[PDB]
Design a binder for this molecule. Structure first.
Ligand SMILES: CCCCCCCCCCCCCCCCCC(=O)OCC(COC(=O)CCCCCCCCCCCCCCCCC)OC(=O)CCCCCCCCCCCCCCCCC
Ligand code: HEA
Ligand code: HEA
Ligand SMILES: CCCCC/C=C\C/C=C/C/C=C/C/C=C\CCCC(=O)O[C@H](COC(=O)CCCCCCCCCCCCCCCCC)COP(=O)(O)OCCN
Ligand SMILES: CCCCC/C=C\C/C=C\C/C=C\C/C=C\CCCC(=O)O[C@H](COC(=O)CCCCCCCCCCCCCCCCC)COP(=O)(O)OCCN
Ligand SMILES: CCCCC/C=C\C/C=C\C/C=C\C/C=C\CCCC(=O)O[C@H](COC(=O)CCCCCCCCCCCCCCCCC)COP(=O)(O)OCCN
Ligand SMILES: CCCCC/C=C/C/C=C\CCCCCCCC(=O)O[C@H](COC(=O)CCCCCCCCCCCCCCC)COP(=O)(O)OCC[N+](C)(C)C
Ligand SMILES: CCCCCC/C=C\CCCCCCCCCC(=O)O[C@H](COC(=O)CCCCCCCCCCCCCCC)COP(=O)(O)OC[C@@H](O)CO
Ligand SMILES: CCCCCC/C=C\CCCCCCCCCC(=O)O[C@H](COC(=O)CCCCCCCCCCCCCCC)COP(=O)(O)OC[C@@H](O)CO
Ligand SMILES: CCCCCCCCCCO[C@@H]1O[C@H](CO)[C@@H](O[C@H]2O[C@H](CO)[C@@H](O)[C@H](O)[C@H]2O)[C@H](O)[C@H]1O
Ligand SMILES: CCCCCCCCCCO[C@@H]1O[C@H](CO)[C@@H](O[C@H]2O[C@H](CO)[C@@H](O)[C@H](O)[C@H]2O)[C@H](O)[C@H]1O
Ligand SMILES: C[C@H](CCC(=O)O)[C@H]1CC[C@H]2[C@@H]3[C@H](O)C[C@@H]4C[C@H](O)CC[C@]4(C)[C@H]3C[C@H](O)[C@]12C
Ligand SMILES: C[C@H](CCC(=O)O)[C@H]1CC[C@H]2[C@@H]3[C@H](O)C[C@@H]4C[C@H](O)CC[C@]4(C)[C@H]3C[C@H](O)[C@]12C
Ligand SMILES: [C-]#N
Ligand code: CUA
Ligand SMILES: [Cu+2]
Ligand SMILES: [Mg+2]
Ligand code: NA
Ligand code: NA
Ligand SMILES: [Zn+2]
Lengths: 514, 227, 57, 80, 93, 259, 84
């Protein structure tokens, strides 16, 4: 029965639980890697005494946090648990294929571990650009294991996207149109469309890297008439959609949390929120070269990519102002999840603004490949994603487990994290403006003060992560079983109790057309 | 070069970098304003016992929330693009210098007349002369004439690198098989420092760039002396 | 050839409690054990190769 | 991208106001921003241009139908 | 031309066949169609079938509302949507 | 217990055996490229085929033999196959992008021209044109098969499907022979790289699509399809039209415009 | 469009069979002729050891590491030229 249930699952809630456990474990790995980064930088000089190992740590930190923490938690975990419940469906459209999207991730992560254990690892950056990542500068198996890890992660997510799009289109109540589905369900649909279209392009590019390294192709090697810059276009044609993939389910969860703890039945401006996410999804395919403003592109191309990139702040601003307008007039409940969501709004806004700075290709010449970019994305993406994840986890943990958390401990955890991430990443703006490069294991002496502060910040967030583990333990240890939650009339996922039974909606909801 | 506790850009050494400073000042004000307005409104929404929980009409306010950000973006894009097109405008340089990136050092070629080339390596910390800067000095600096428009051509003989000099507003990736052009003009004599800006393996942190800007007559004597 | 779909419908609808991947009978169990043994043993073998490849040899 | 369920009137109005007309407005901006007369090139009486094998059936026979004196030279050059 | 291909009438089985047979009778036991509302007054409540004694109703109170109002409807006296007051009455089997 | 029309699938081991097959194939390719051994790769290919065989066998059992494919379930599978084909279109789009990037801006190492100096392309009016007529003709014959099935005609469905498969096999054998006769190789710079990787992935998809058609042929011999319910045949025909359209793009781009 | 047929009415199985045997298979037969007329071995070109061709950055994982997977000795020279 254990193996049938947890290895042979065809159940959306149990597969969601597997993804949350996997993503939480990966989050420990990725946090440990980030602490090693900041330990190397925490004083001038060398700590590891091996800058290839430092480069391997940075590369693995990013792959772990993106492919094994954020996407499995947001899409595999919250998406599987919540989407079928929010539409009254009895499971996902392809409940068995869903299990393979899960089970592809432990082998994907094992391939990443293998890459770091053999030879001298893949110290490439998560971009994996040739020729650094080719067979002369990274001879041996590490880069090929990294490529295969990405292939398996990509297959998992492509099949998961097929599953979520099919489920959301085909399995709502017959009376429910797309414009009666909750915003989290929209956010998952749009994320899945982006995954469907973008991951096959990455798969093509990394396959061409694999064949240049092993079959004597020359897609990226000028000696054969290839071009390293072609790899960058293919990678970023996926990688820009990927940054919206990482945040869109977060936007969905934030809309639900802000609505709920404002005591409102609905988010402000629902159709504007749908418009904004669709517009971000669409524009997200036409801006990628802003990752390439220093490669030598023509000026008119730089001008186009600057302009298209700035257009995205318009629909994103609609979402920010709409979250503020959802708070407007609320009976505000100062729950820990609400604190996470308010932290998200502010930190996402800071990071999105420094992204707007970077969109100006003239200024990006000076800021590219510096810690300004690292500060932009650890605000807008890294800590945007983490804060929405923690808000969703605190808010929905009682649904998934049947048990309540201690709210005072959860507020303490929020406060420690908010201090820690700001101490870590705010000083990186100064490092970037004053010219410190990213991807460095050591820095000229002038940069010492802000590196020292940033590394001290990293330990504060470590204290928060350890506390989060204790808080989860305390809830399972004490066994306070949920009775009721408010606002079930506008939050269907709660209406089957906590946790809901293995099978829900065996008798579907009744929804008529008036 | 940067100095301890610095918060913003290195001082501008070239006119384009001056322009960038003023453009940055213009944009950062907007970032500050918008970020503080969002913070303020968050606190405004959270500090009243008054309520309004019935459905709110969104059309009127969404015009404000799209038109105003669109205007703001245009007010950023206009100076941004003017500077972009200024940078690209035809200049007619007096000198062309090539740089080739390698793991892990730069080489320089001055082949307008004479065939001069040399390598430029970081000074290890153990060899620095007293008062020299850790991770920044090189054995052979890029000697160049001040107050003159110079064409730099940038490539690589192995992996990607990127040739950067922040105080001149310069960062041009060094890609094998490609010859990327940028223009350099220093308003002042002096030593101007930069660091390799595309991850190129284990010694990416340790292949700096040092320009040495001197009057033309001194540049010519230095060139002549290489014969 | 003759249409024997009805006989397979009766087989795969028999109320014997078997999950669909085993409901064809003993052959299903053989093919399953073969597949699972290859998968699990190959996985153990791949972990050995990792250990081997993790050190200079 | 997304919705794909019913493509009804509501969806096509959403696309009209949410994507199509914003695109027209952006391109209208782009155009009325690169507008402004550009220097007319030196006149050169190339034989493959300003073709006259029969007079035009209007005007003096020598002016094209939407002749713009600022930018359309006659076979003998620009008009005064 | 020729024959030899079975028809659904001949060969559909299981739930597929149940859905096909019910559709012929004009019945919808498997909830494929959206039910059409009544006037929803106390005298003419919306009639909600269930195989049990309670079922979740979602009420789209006005056409084009994006917010759906969800609640369990129990057997017995008709209940009203907490947003619009429209009446629903459970009709077990 | 349910009163919806959707399919609650029995707990299954095939997702796990499929995921482990992927681990074995990828670690297997690594061991082949780097450690001179095909062992893991052979195990992985075997477990992959076993997993596909048993998983799709079970889908047939669930549908033809057990009746779980109600119209709502079939509609989901239609969306799923369309979305899968879209993802495969984007995968090929990356290889077309690489081909156009390299051929529209040929670098000095090529001679600054396309085709590169020293490359002698195949004549697109010879076997490549024959391959084009073969795949176009098989798009006509699969459409005859589909209409025969809908019209209840077993014999002509089987004849037309057999003709379709024969043409797919003919394409594959012609392409195998062309690969052998080609005077350029995958190691012949970016011309060989784009030619063999793009047409090779397409040839893999022809073999996949032909295999799917062969499954459908045997299921038709066994009377699985009804005149109205035959989604496996519909999906194999959509996939086969996808393979035909990718070939037309390859033929126009790489063989004709790129010669 | 630049076709020349007619039928329409209904496109049923009879029409698609007609197209299969009346247009598609004859086209395959004709291209099979065209092809089995321009068949034959042309004179292979002088070998020149161009550095953008016969690329070898890592040995192939089969044979002696220096032969492509579908190596044809008649038409595929090695980096050192044709084989004897
Ligand atoms: C904003 C995120 C929260 C975390 C904030 C932590 C930091 C607090 C600042 C909280 C307020 C931040 C104000 C900027 C701090 C530095 C002042 C400055 O002169 O910056 C100027 C430039 C470069 O300027 C120059 O060319 C040199 C000028 C120096 C001469 C005067 C010296 C003394 C100035 C005082 C500086 C203090 C050092 C700060 C040292 C800080 C160490 C941690 O630097 C930069 O561009 C920094 C780029 C940051 C980009 C994001 C901006 C939007 C977020 C902040 C507003 C939201 C509400 C905050 C309300 C905050 C609510 C929590
Ligand atoms: C969650 C992930 C995420 C998200 C959502 C974003 C969102 C944005 N990003 Fe960022 N970005 C990354 C993750 C993300 N990014 C990562 C990981 C990298 C680096 C990759 C690497 O090299 O490893 C990166 C790199 C990166 C670069 C390249 C810089 C360089 O390498 O030199 C650029 C440049 O344009 C950029 C811009 C932006 C912009 C304009 C947005 C916008 O979508 C933000 C829009 C939001 C707002 C603007 C705030 C809210 C709006 C309002 C309050 C309305 C009013 C505002 C105005 C009128 C301005 N990003
Ligand atoms: C999601 C993405 C993500 C996240 C969360 C993070 C988190 C952190 N990162 Fe990030 N980082 C990247 C993505 C991310 N990073 C990427 C893409 C790069 C670029 C790589 C490259 O250059 O190639 C990078 C690079 C990077 C650098 C630059 C290295 C260099 O240029 O040399 C640094 C330096 O300080 C840094 C530090 C940190 C720190 C201190 C944290 C954290 O310690 C901050 C605190 C956050 C946490 C502790 C999260 C904990 C969450 C969980 C444990 C989940 C729990 C789960 C459930 C409740 C279900 N990162
Ligand atoms: C009959 C028509 C063709 C049918 C298919 C035949 C086999 C091709 C297999 C296709 C797999 C496609 C991958 C493409 C890789 C290259 C193979 C290209 C096609 C091919 O077969 O190319 C051959 C080279 O094969 C070689 O190197 C060896 C190739 C074998 C090893 C491949 C290993 C790499 C596989 C990696 C796959 C990654 C996939 C990831 C998918 C993720 C999606 C989310 C060409 O032979 P040649 O002697 O150089 O020149 C002919 C000279 N007379
Ligand atoms: C703005 C769009 C519509 C334009 C309408 C103007 C009247 C045209 C009516 C029909 C248009 C159809 C195409 C006719 C061919 C030529 C017109 C082409 C479009 C046009 O209007 O071309 C103009 C010339 O018109 C000229 O010669 C004069 C053309 C006037 C006489 C046309 C003769 C009719 C041709 C016979 C058509 C037979 C069709 C048979 C179909 C069966 C261009 O002006 P320009 O000053 O040279 O350059 C601009 C310099 N600043
Ligand atoms: C490089 C050169 C460029 C030049 C300029 C290029 C211009 C291209 C022009 C594009 C036109 C674009 C679209 C306008 C579309 C209008 C068609 C209107 C009718 C319609 O739309 O209804 C269709 C009717 O079908 C039906 O049986 C229709 C049946 C009609 C029967 C006619 C029979 C004639 C004989 C055919 C025999 C063939 C035998 C083999 C439904 O099909 P659909 O799936 O929606 O696809 C439409 C795709 N465009
Ligand atoms: C960076 C660049 C961009 C900066 C953006 C700055 C944005 C500032 C925005 C300005 C907001 C101005 C509000 C304008 C609309 C005012 C509506 C109003 O003034 O009134 C409200 C209407 O609410 C309704 O439906 C709708 C009511 C509220 C609609 C507006 C809700 C708040 C919107 C602002 C939310 C604050 C945060 C925005 C960011 C209340 O009205 P009622 O008729 O229901 O009760 C009347 C009942 N009697 C009369 C019959 C007794
Ligand atoms: C470098 C080498 C890397 C190698 C990596 C290899 C990785 C994976 C090993 C794959 C093993 C596959 C095993 C067979 C999977 C069949 C899945 C399938 O067919 O799934 C179906 C759904 O997807 C549908 O239709 C539509 C979709 C069908 C998808 C079939 C499998 C695709 C696997 C490759 C994916 C990437 C494709 C390329 C994109 C770039 C059925 O859904 P179930 O939930 O099962 O059932 C539902 C029941 O109602 C049916 O009665
Ligand atoms: C390698 C070789 C793989 C070749 C693929 C073979 C696929 C065989 C699928 C058989 C199962 C099947 O066809 O299942 C059908 C459902 O389709 C379904 O799941 C649709 C299933 C879609 C399978 C899609 C397969 C594409 C595989 C691509 C895999 C690799 C691609 C990547 C390469 C880089 C079953 O429904 P029906 O047909 O309506 O029957 C029911 C009637 O009898 C009732 O009257
Ligand atoms: C279902 C469970 C399946 C479990 C997996 C089966 C385990 C197989 C054990 C055999 O292992 C083989 O041992 C050979 C050594 O004896 C290796 O040959 C290699 O090593 C040789 C040197 O002995 C060389 O000739 C070559 O590089 C190469 O052939 C080869 O790599 C390896 O696989
Ligand atoms: C039922 C479950 C149990 C199954 C156990 C399977 C055990 C297989 C062990 C044999 O290992 C093989 O050894 C070969 C020789 O030792 C290798 O050939 C290698 O060496 C050859 C020498 O002839 C070369 O030609 C090849 O290209 C090269 O791949 C081959 O790759 C490898 O697999
Ligand atoms: C028409 C469509 C849906 C309306 C509905 O059926 O409920 C609505 C939803 C969101 C609206 C858009 C957003 O509110 C953002 C923009 C707001 C501006 O005031 C008009 C253009 C603007 C782009 C809007 C056009 C249009 O009214 C949209 C696209
Ligand atoms: C045996 C079967 C008759 C239908 C039925 O079984 O009653 C017939 C009908 C159509 C026949 C097939 C089709 O004519 C297509 C093929 C024709 C080839 O010449 C022989 C094999 C070939 C595959 C045939 C084998 C066999 O005789 C089939 C399969
Ligand atoms: C951000 N890209
Ligand atoms: Cu050279 Cu970094
Ligand atoms: Cu981007
Ligand atoms: Mg860079
Ligand atoms: Na260090
Ligand atoms: Na059909
Ligand atoms: Zn109601």
């Amino acid at each position: 029965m254990f193996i049938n249930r947890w290895l042979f699952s065809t159940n959306h809630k149990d597969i969601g639980t597997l993804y949350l456990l996997f993503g939480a474990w990966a989050g420990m790995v990725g946090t440990a890697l980030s602490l090693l980064i900041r330990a190397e930088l925490g004083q001038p000089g060398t700590l590891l005494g091996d800058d290839q190992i430092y480069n391997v740590v940075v590369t693995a930190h990013a792959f772990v946090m993106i492919f094994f923490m954020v996407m499995p938690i947001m899409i595999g975990g919250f998406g599987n648990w919540l989407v079928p419940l929010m539409i009254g469906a009895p499971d996902m459209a392809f409940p068995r294929m869903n299990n393979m999207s899960f089970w592809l991730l432990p082998p994907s992560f094992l391939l990443l571990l293998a890459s770091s254990m053999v030879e001298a690892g893949a110290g490439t950056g998560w971009t994996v650009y040739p020729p650094l990542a080719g067979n002369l500068a990274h001879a041996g198996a590490s880069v090929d294991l990294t490529i295969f890890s990405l292939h398996l992660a990509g297959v998992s997510s492509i099949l998961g996207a097929i599953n979520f799009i099919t489920t959301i289109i085909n399995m709502k109540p017959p009376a429910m149109s797309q414009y009666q589905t909750p915003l989290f369900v929209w956010s998952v649909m749009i994320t899945a469309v982006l995954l469907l279209l973008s991951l096959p392009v990455l798969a093509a590019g990394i396959t061409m890297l694999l064949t240049d390294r092993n079959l004597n192709t020359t897609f990226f090697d000028p000696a054969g008439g290839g071009d390293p810059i072609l790899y960058q276009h293919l990678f970023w044609f996926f990688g820009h959609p990927e940054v919206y993939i990482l945040i869109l389910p977060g936007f969905g969860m934030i809309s639900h949390i802000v609505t709920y703890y404002s005591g409102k039945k609905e988010p402000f401006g629902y159709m504007g929120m749908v418009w904004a996410m669709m517009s971000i999804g669409f524009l997200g395919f036409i801006v990628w070269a802003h990752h390439m403003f220093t490669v030598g592109m023509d000026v008119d191309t730089r001008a186009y990519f600057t302009s298209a990139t700035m257009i995205i702040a318009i629909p994103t601003g609609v979402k920010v102002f709409s979250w503020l307008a959802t708070l407007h007039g609320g009976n505000i409940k100062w729950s820990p999840a609400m604190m996470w969501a308010l932290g998200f709004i502010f930190l996402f806004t800071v990071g999105g603004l420094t992204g707007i700075v970077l969109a100006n290709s003239s200024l990006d010449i000076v800021l590219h490949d510096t810690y300004y970019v690292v500060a932009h994305f650890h605000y807008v993406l890294s800590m945007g994603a983490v804060f929405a994840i923690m808000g969703g986890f605190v808010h929905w943990f009682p649904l998934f487990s049947g048990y309540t958390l201690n709210d005072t401990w959860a507020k303490i955890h929020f406060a420690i994290m908010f201090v820690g991430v700001n101490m870590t990443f705010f000083p990186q703006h100064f490092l970037g403006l004053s010219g410190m490069p990213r991807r460095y294991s050591d820095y000229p002496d002038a940069y010492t003060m802000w590196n020292t502060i940033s590394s001290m910040g990293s330990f504060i967030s470590l204290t928060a992560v350890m506390l989060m583990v204790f808080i989860i333990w305390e809830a399972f240890a004490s066994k306070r079983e949920v009775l009721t939650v408010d606002l079930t009339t506008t939050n269907l996922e709660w209406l089957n109790g906590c946790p809901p039974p293995y099978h829900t909606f065996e008798e579907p909801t009744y929804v008529n057309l008036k | 070069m940067a100095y301890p506790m610095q918060l913003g850009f290195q001082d501008a050494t070239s006119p384009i970098m001056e322009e960038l400073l003023h453009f940055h000042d213009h944009t950062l004000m907007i970032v500050f304003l918008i970020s503080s307005l969002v913070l303020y409104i968050i606190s405004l929404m959270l500090t009243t016992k008054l309520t309004h929980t019935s459905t709110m009409d969104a059309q009127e306010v969404e015009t404000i929330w799209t038109i105003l950000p669109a205007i703001i973006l245009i007010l950023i894009a206009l100076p941004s693009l003017r500077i972009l097109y200024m940078m690209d405008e035809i200049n007619n340089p007096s000198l062309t210098v090539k740089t080739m990136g390698h793991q892990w050092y730069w080489s320089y070629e001055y082949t307008d007349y004479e065939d001069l080339s040399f390598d430029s390596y970081m000074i290890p910390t153990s060899e620095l002369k007293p008062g020299e800067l850790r991770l920044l000095e090189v054995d052979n600096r890029v000697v160049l004439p001040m107050e003159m428009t110079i064409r730099m051509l940038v490539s690589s003989e192995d992996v990607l690198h990127s040739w950067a000099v922040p105080s001149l507003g310069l960062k041009t990736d060094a890609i094998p098989g490609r010859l990327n052009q940028t223009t350099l003009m220093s308003s002042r004599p002096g030593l101007y420092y930069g660091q390799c800006s595309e991850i190129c393996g284990s010694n990416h942190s340790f292949m700096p760039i040092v320009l040495e800007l001197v009057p033309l007559k001194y540049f010519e004597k230095w060139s002549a002396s290489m014969l | 050839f003759e249409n024997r779909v009805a006989e397979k419908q009766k087989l795969f609808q028999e109320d014997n409690g078997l999950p669909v991947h085993l409901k064809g009978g003993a052959t299903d169990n053989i093919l399953y054990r073969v597949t699972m043994t290859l998968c699990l043993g190959g996985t153990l073998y791949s972990l050995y190769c990792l250990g081997w490849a993790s050190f200079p040899h | 991208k997304g919705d794909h369920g019913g493509t009804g009137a509501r969806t096509w109005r959403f696309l009209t106001f949410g994507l199509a007309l914003p695109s027209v407005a952006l391109c209208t901006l782009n155009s009325w921003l690169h507008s402004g007369h550009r220097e007319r090139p030196a006149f050169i009486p190339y034989h493959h241009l300003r073709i006259r094998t029969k007079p035009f059936s209007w005007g003096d026979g020598n002016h094209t139908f939407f002749h713009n004196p600022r930018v359309n030279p006659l076979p003998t050059g620009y008009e005064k | 031309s020729g024959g030899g291909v079975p028809t659904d009438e001949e060969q559909a089985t299981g739930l597929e066949r149940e859905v096909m047979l019910a559709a012929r009778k004009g019945q919808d036991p498997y909830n494929i169609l959206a039910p059409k509302a009544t006037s929803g007054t106390k005298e003419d409540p919306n009639l909600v079938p269930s195989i049990t004694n309670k079922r979740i109703v979602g009420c789209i109170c006005e056409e084009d509302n994006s917010t759906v109002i969800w609640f369990w409807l129990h057997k017995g006296e008709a209940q009203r949507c907490p947003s619009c007051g429209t009446h629903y009455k459970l009709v077990p089997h | 217990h349910q009163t919806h029309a959707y399919h609650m699938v029995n707990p299954s081991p095939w997702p796990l055996t499929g995921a482990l097959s992927a681990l074995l194939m990828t670690s297997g390719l690594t061991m082949w490229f780097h450690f001179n051994s095909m062992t893991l790769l052979m195990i992985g290919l075997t477990t992959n085929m076993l997993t596909m065989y048993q998983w799709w066998r079970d889908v047939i059992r669930e549908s033809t033999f057990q009746g779980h494919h109600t119209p709502a379930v079939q509609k989901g599978l239609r969306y799923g196959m369309i979305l899968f084909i879209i993802s495969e279109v984007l995968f090929f789009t990356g290889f077309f992008w690489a081909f156009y990037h390299s051929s529209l801006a040929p670098t000095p190492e090529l001679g600054g021209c396309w085709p590169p100096t020293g490359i002698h392309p195949l004549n697109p009016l010879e076997v490549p044109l024959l391959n084009t007529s073969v795949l176009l003709a098989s798009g006509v014959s699969i459409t005859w098969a589909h209409h025969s099935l809908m019209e209840g005609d077993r014999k002509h469905m089987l004849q037309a499907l057999f003709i379709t498969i024969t043409l797919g096999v003919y394409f594959t054998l012609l392409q195998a022979s062309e690969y052998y006769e080609a005077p350029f190789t995958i190691s012949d710079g970016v011309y060989g790289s784009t030619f063999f990787v793009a047409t090779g992935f397409h040839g893999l998809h022809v073999i996949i699509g032909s295999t799917f058609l062969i499954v459908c042929f045997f299921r038709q011999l066994k009377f699985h399809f009804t005149s109205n319910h035959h989604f496996g045949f519909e999906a194999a025909a959509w996939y086969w039209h996808f393979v035909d359209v990718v070939w037309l793009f390859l033929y126009v781009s790489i063989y004709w415009w790129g010669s």
